[PDB]
Nucleic acid binder design. Structure first.
Lengths: 269, 162, 62, 454, 28, 459
RNA sequence: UCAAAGAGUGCU
């Protein structure tokens, strides 16, 4: 069905010549290369690199069109299919690549970055669904959970949503000390902003983390006990005593990082 | 009336979404049965929607038991919670009827299926195995099955190095 | 130059209501050799469609 | 000078990658594609040939069937693969159509099962229910354990009985509410929670042979009487609405699922009559392709098809807008078709014949139920219009129309044609001399009279 | 559709969710 | 009316789709148009053009100089991948000039008048004197067409699989390759046939005769459809464009005529030829090829309504109305055996005494080939599958008619003796009752539409 | 090697 994708380009390419930005011969060069790319994607042996090179191609085509618009048309945006057509396609190619290669973590990031960069074109809701899909293919990679938690605490400043991320992320990945460290880091940021707002409120006129500290310590030990024991319990008493030693030291080191973390927050006691 | 399919792997738990519903009246027709063997046809029926690998060897055995006595683990609860919409009632296809009541208790809004239609798809999922995971990291099932095998067995017999 | 009765249709087929109607259509080449891939799809789509494995319930109140 | 020559890039047409698909350049200039007319016709002719081949309508039978001739078939409107059957032996069965086995079998009545229906009673997921009536003057409610869901884990058997002073000959259940109506010597409305008949409906002393609830205007009911009459009712008014008397008795009635005001009637004059509920003075359509009385009729859940089960050991398929069957199904193993029903997906046909076996047929014999590839879907679909397009070409008609009908049916048709020709010649002779011979529309001959004139 | 961003349980499934919500009711 | 506007709606959508595909067309055919008015197209010589074209194009250009059986009647496969050549004294060789491997060699020392490729490159047909032979790619002869005798021109129809043979005899035979039986035999009675050509649009064969009358022919038909004299003198050759709208003839009296089949009119006439043209070929683009003995003159846009588009030798003081040859080439010490346009190539084949030479001509071939129909780069696995599909969609012979768009239109003992007599009596009754109806039908029409003589009118 | 003809495997 390579043609079916190809025919979608014709109304766009017709718009280019009609506006006069691109000559007949020039567009033929564009369509030819597009034709070459589509066959590669639709064929066996296609790789994620194949989607990347195609995606890079349109971006340069997009730059040529807009840059040409100022030189020839002398208009910021010509009201026609051409202006938003390329941007629709690039997202479409990406979606195919993500579906075609969900495993490649790298290729997703381009979509989140690409989708995020053109915020005006692309509503945050579209960004949400991609994260919903991406978390949900890879629940065990903590680095998503912080990433989407990150995005909606800075771009949107919706702490209620960001907190739910850590709650869900911790539900899947309770043994990752980093995400706990990341979750307490967010909470203390929320408290510091809140009290600073309170200070500003006066001028113009936290315990929660410690609970995270405590509950974190219990589960990490529980999982660290699970590992180093394998399928079965340890019959030897002395070895069982040892397994208590590593967790204490592992938990002690895991505590010590927070002791460093608290040091940053001057506002807090 | 099925939309989501629950499957379990030695590496983890896999959920599938049923894009197309096979004919139920003609379930026994050779032509529908040949499709289950055919990977190309099968991919049109379902699509892998989630996979959450087990954290380590210990977790797999614990879940391997919990599946055996028809119980829901914390890992299973988390996955189903994230995937199944609240919704009249979303339908989930499951191999075990005994896991049915357990799933219903934790999630009142899900209705489980274990009819031959569900079994037919579950067979297809297990037929193609890692090919349906579309490149996702599921290790090697055959070795992981070997990994859990005596591990599940020796546990019940209470085998020990002593 | 007499036309061959073998290839002359007996009567105007349904849904076309008059003789000139059928020749206007019959000038159309349906095949994809004369039609674009997209254009082929709208023509070839039939009026009645159903999805396998679902009950077609009676129409709800308009 | 300025010179250009045709220039072929080897890489563009021959991919460097072995796995990459080669380019298929397209030029739609009509000059490059001559004989568009001949090519399409030839493909249409080939497609017509392909169609007759794959027509393998029979798929199988449900278990070992019933004890005596099956006379009552009820289909679960809320579910695809469950079906209820009854035979004159007094036994009723619930079938798992997907597995072609039985859920449960009950010896429901001493006499004949004269009406069977599936419902979902509202007593004031794990079980289904049917209503069975018989000439033994009792109606029995049954509960069946089903494996559709595994959210639980019994009480399978009779739930309730409704006694009647007179024998009952047919039953139907209101879709929206638990109320159901039973037709014997006199048509009643019943409630599941009331043992006595809740209300009595009757045009007159005449007995009712069959009934069928409307599927969209669920408060409307239609019935058939032994006096060759069709009676309409409205539950909201709790009274009969219209009565029309036919030349013949009608065995069965079905409401069109897409037109709430439109229904079809199975008749004893080898015909099925398609009627508008608002103007009964005429018929919307007539179907005449059977050679014996039509016992049963139904509407497709798609609404574009009806079937007519006839005493002549055959089943026919009719387009609603066309007055002649597009298809005929038969076997030596047919003895007397009494019931015909659809799968709720509109893909399969259920037939009940007095030999005691229940069978399944493909709605379109050539169609196959596997999921098709897009390439398969396009081509299989592509053949469809070209057949619809060149439908009246002589050779296409000769191949497409042909069916193997039993010798008994054809000879009846040949004699039947000789009847009509001999008749037609006779009235034609009359019109030469008689001054006043009013022309009677075929759509009105079957109507003898209507009570309410308009 | 089920979304991680909005909590879909309507009750706190994880014991962490029990502890945090207790403070939030306590705080304000 | 509204439904027809709807039906007409898909037409505007359909033609737009055709334009949309026309938009996509991968390649463009070669052009040649002067920068400077002083320099003209008919002084430019091939060697300079040979230098201009690419190295591959020069390598693609083929020049095969053989005298053992020359002159040489060149022939190109429909796809153009494989080229079939038959010498004058009559050996025939099949090879892929592009691939660089000969498919078959045939060194028979019997005079052959022409040759033609069959359904595929694998099988092809050659015309020996007094018989017609069929050969394989391997070079073996599958069979011999006993019926076909004294065949000069052999032509094969791909979709209908019909092979047609023209000869001096006046007997003509149609043979379908797949079936193996000749569809029909027809005698023109007009004597020998100098020229045979087919119009692909209608699939109607064209036969010329010494009187000058070019004759259209059909399989099912017992006669020729149409009778048209181009010239006083015998026609040397007849050329039909692929579209079929245009048909050209050159008379032996040095006259060139341009005709149109659709309206059946003579488009243009030229007497300026110094001597009769040996052979005539028409490009897919409409460019016309005239071969007179040594020199071949090419006219761009020869097929057009305007009288100025008509071919004209030289010019009248650089008059713009006069139309000069678009290319003029001469082979010194040579005569043109035949002219053949190379399929899907910007190239014109030329047949001549010294051997086979191929002349590069801008715009000669159609730029963008239809792969579904024919693909030069068709692989052998696809090739066989294409054949089978063509077999499945083979067009019957009787489908051939003057117009394809017309088709589909809507328009015992004693007992037997007693038995014989009774059915007779029943027959007289039928005839007589029908007639009693006939007068009664006559009476209704009649009803619908001297004083003493009145005094006695009652009597 | 080409060159024509077979019989399976992978996969869209």
């Amino acid at each position: 069905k390579t043609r079916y994708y190809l025919e979608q380009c014709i109304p766009e390419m017709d718009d280019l010549v009609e506006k006069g930005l691109f000559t007949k011969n020039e567009v033929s060069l564009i369509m030819k290369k597009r034709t070459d790319f589509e066959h590669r994607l639709n064929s066996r042996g296609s790789s994620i690199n194949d989607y990347i090179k195609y995606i890079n191609y349109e971006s340069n085509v997009n730059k040529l069109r807009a840059k040409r618009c100022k030189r020839i048309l002398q208009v910021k945006k010509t009201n026609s299919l051409s202006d938003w057509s390329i941007q629709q396609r690039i997202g479409f190619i990406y979606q195919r690549g993500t579906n075609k290669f969900p495993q490649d973590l790298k290729f997703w990031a381009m979509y989140l970055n690409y989708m995020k960069a053109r915020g005006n074109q692309t509503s945050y809701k579209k960004i949400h669904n991609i994260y919903n899909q991406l978390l949900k293919l890879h629940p065990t990679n903590v680095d998503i959970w912080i990433s989407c938690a990150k995005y909606e605490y800075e771009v949107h400043a919706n702490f209620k949503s960001c907190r739910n991320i850590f709650q869900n992320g911790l539900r899947f990945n309770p043994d990752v000390p980093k995400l706990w460290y990341e979750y307490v880091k967010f909470e203390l940021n929320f408290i510091t902003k809140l009290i600073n707002r309170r200070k500003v409120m006066g001028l113009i006129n936290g315990d929660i983390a410690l609970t995270i500290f405590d509950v974190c310590m219990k589960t990490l030990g529980k999982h660290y006990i699970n590992k180093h024991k394998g399928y079965y319990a340890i019959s030897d008493s002395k070895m069982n005593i040892e397994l208590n030693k590593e967790t204490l030291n592992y938990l002690f080191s895991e505590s010590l990082r927070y002791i460093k973390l608290f040091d940053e927050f001057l506002d807090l006691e | 009336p099925i939309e989501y399919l629950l499957f379990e792997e030695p590496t983890g738990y896999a959920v599938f979404k049923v894009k197309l519903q096979q004919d139920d009246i003609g379930s026994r027709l050779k032509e529908v049965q040949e499709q289950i063997n055919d990977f190309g046809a099968f991919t049109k029926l379902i699509e892998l929607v989630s996979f959450a690998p087990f954290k380590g060897a210990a977790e797999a055995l614990e879940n391997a038991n919990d599946i055996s006595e028809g119980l829901v683990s914390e890992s299973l609860k988390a996955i189903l919670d994230l995937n199944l919409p609240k919704a009249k009632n979303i339908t989930l296809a499951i191999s075990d009827k005994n896991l049915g009541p357990s799933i219903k208790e934790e999630f009142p809004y899900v209705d489980c299926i274990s009819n031959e239609l569900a079994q037919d798809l579950i067979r297809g999922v297990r037929l193609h195995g890692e090919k349906l995971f579309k490149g996702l990291q599921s290790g090697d099932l055959e070795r992981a099955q070997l990994g859990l095998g005596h591990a599940y067995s020796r546990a019940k017999v209470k085998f020990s190095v002593q | 130059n007499k036309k061959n009765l073998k290839y002359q249709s007996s009567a105007v087929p349904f849904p076309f209501e008059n003789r000139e109607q059928y020749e206007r259509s019959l000038r159309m080449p349906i095949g994809q050799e004369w039609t674009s891939r997209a254009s082929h799809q709208e023509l070839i789509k039939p009026r009645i469609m159903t999805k396998p494995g679902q009950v077609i319930d009676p129409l709800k109140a308009p | 000078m300025k010179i250009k020559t045709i220039k072929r890039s080897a890489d563009d047409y021959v991919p460097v990658k072995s796995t990459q698909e080669s380019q298929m350049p397209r030029n739609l200039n009509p000059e490059l594609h001559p004989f568009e007319r001949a090519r399409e016709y030839t493909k249409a002719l080939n497609a017509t040939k392909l169609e007759r081949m794959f027509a393998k309508p029979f798929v199988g039978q449900l278990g070992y069937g019933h004890r005596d001739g099956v006379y009552a078939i009820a289909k679960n409107y809320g579910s695809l693969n469950k079906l209820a059957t009854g035979s004159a032996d007094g036994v009723i069965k619930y079938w798992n159509m997907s597995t072609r086995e039985e859920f449960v079998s009950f010896k429901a009545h001493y006499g004949l099962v004269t009406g069977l229906c599936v419902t979902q009673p509202r007593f004031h997921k794990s079980q289904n229910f049917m209503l069975s009536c018989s000439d033994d003057k009792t109606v029995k409610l049954w509960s069946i354990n089903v494996d559709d869901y595994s959210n639980k884990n019994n009480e399978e058997g009779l739930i309730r009985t409704f006694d009647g002073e007179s024998a009952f000959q047919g039953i139907d259940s209101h879709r929206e509410n638990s109320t159901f109506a039973t037709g014997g010597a006199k048509i009643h409305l019943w409630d599941v929670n009331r043992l006595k008949p809740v209300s009595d409906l009757s045009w007159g002393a005449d007995n009712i042979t069959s009934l069928k609830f409307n599927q969209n205007e669920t408060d409307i009911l239609a019935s058939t009487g032994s006096d060759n009459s069709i009676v309409l009712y409205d539950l909201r008014t709790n009274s009969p609405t219209q009565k029309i008397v036919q030349t013949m008795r009608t065995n069965a009635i079905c409401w069109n699922p897409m037109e709430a005001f439109n229904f079809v009637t199975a008749n004893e004059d080898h015909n099925a009559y398609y009627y508008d509920m608002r103007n009964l003075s005429r018929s919307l359509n007539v179907f005449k392709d059977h050679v014996s009385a039509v016992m049963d009729v139904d509407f497709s859940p798609t609404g574009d098809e009806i079937v007519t089960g006839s005493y002549d050991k055959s089943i026919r398929i009719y387009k609603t807008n066309h007055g002649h069957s597009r298809e005929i199904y038969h076997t030596k193993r047919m003895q007397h078709v009494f019931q015909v029903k659809y799968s709720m997906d509109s893909k399969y046909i259920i037939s009940g014949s007095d030999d005691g076996n229940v069978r399944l047929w493909r709605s379109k014999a050539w169609e196959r139920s596997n999921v098709k590839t897009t390439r398969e879907k396009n081509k299989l679909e592509y053949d469809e219009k070209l057949k619809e397009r060149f439908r009246h070409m002589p050779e296409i008609k000769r191949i497409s129309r042909h069916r193997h009908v039993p010798q008994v049916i054809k000879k009846a048709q040949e004699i039947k044609n000789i009847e009509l020709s001999s008749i037609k010649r006779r009235e034609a002779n009359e019109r030469r001399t008689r001054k006043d011979m009013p022309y009677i529309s075929e759509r009105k001959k079957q109507i003898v009279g209507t009570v309410h004139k308009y | 559709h089920a979304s991680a961003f909005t909590r879909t349980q309507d009750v706190p499934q994880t014991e962490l969710q029990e502890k945090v919500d207790q403070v939030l009711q306590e705080s304000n | 009316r509204a439904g027809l506007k709807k039906i007409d709606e898909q037409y505007k959508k359909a033609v737009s789709s055709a334009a949309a595909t026309d938009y996509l067309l991968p390649e463009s055919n070669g052009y040649l148009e002067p920068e400077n008015e002083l320099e003209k197209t008919f002084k430019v010589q091939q060697s300079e053009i040979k230098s201009s074209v690419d190295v591959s194009t020069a390598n693609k250009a083929l020049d095969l100089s053989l005298k053992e059986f020359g002159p040489y009647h060149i022939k190109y496969a429909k796809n153009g991948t494989h080229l079939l050549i038959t010498g004058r004294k009559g050996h025939v060789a099949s090879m892929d000039w592009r691939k660089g491997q000969l498919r078959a060699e045939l060194f028979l020392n019997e005079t052959c008048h022409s040759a033609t490729y069959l359904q595929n490159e694998q099988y092809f047909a050659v015309a020996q004197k007094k018989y017609t032979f069929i050969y394989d790619h391997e070079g073996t002869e599958l069979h011999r067409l006993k019926q076909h005798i004294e065949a000069r021109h052999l032509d094969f129809l791909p979709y209908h699989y019909l092979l047609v043979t023209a000869g001096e005899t006046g007997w003509l035979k149609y043979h379908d390759v797949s079936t193996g039986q000749l569809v029909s035999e027809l005698r023109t009675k007009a004597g020998p046939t100098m020229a045979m050509a087919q119009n692909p649009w209608n699939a109607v064969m064209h036969l010329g005769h010494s009187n000058g009358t070019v004759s259209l022919w059909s399989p099912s038909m017992p006669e020729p459809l149409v009778k048209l004299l181009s010239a006083r003198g015998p026609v040397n050759s007849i050329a039909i464009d692929r579209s079929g709208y245009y048909m050209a003839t050159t008379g032996a009296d040095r006259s060139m005529k341009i005709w149109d089949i659709r309206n059946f009119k003579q488009l243009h006439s030229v007497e300026s030829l110094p001597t009769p043209g040996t052979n005539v070929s028409i490009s897919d683009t409409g460019l016309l090829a005239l071969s007179r003995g040594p020199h071949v003159t090419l006219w761009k846009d020869a097929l057009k309504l305007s009288g100025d588009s008509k071919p004209c030798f030289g010019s009248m003081g650089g008059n713009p109305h006069r139309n000069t040859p678009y290319m003029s080439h001469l082979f010194a010490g040579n005569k043109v055996e035949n002219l053949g346009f190379v399929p899907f190539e910007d190239l014109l084949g030329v047949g001549h005494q010294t051997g086979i030479t191929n002349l590069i001509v801008p715009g000669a071939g159609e730029a963008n080939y239809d792969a579904l129909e024919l693909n030069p780069f068709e692989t052998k696995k696809q090739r066989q599958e294409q054949e089978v599909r063509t077999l499945l969609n083979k067009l019957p012979a009787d489908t051939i008619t003057l117009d394809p768009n017309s088709i589909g239109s809507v328009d015992s003992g004693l007992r037997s003796f007693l038995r014989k007599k009774t059915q007779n009596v029943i027959d007289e009754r039928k005839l007589r009752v029908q007639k009693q109806l006939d007068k009664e039908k006559n009476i209704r029409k009649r009803n619908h539409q001297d004083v003493i003589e009145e005094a006695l009118s009652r009597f």
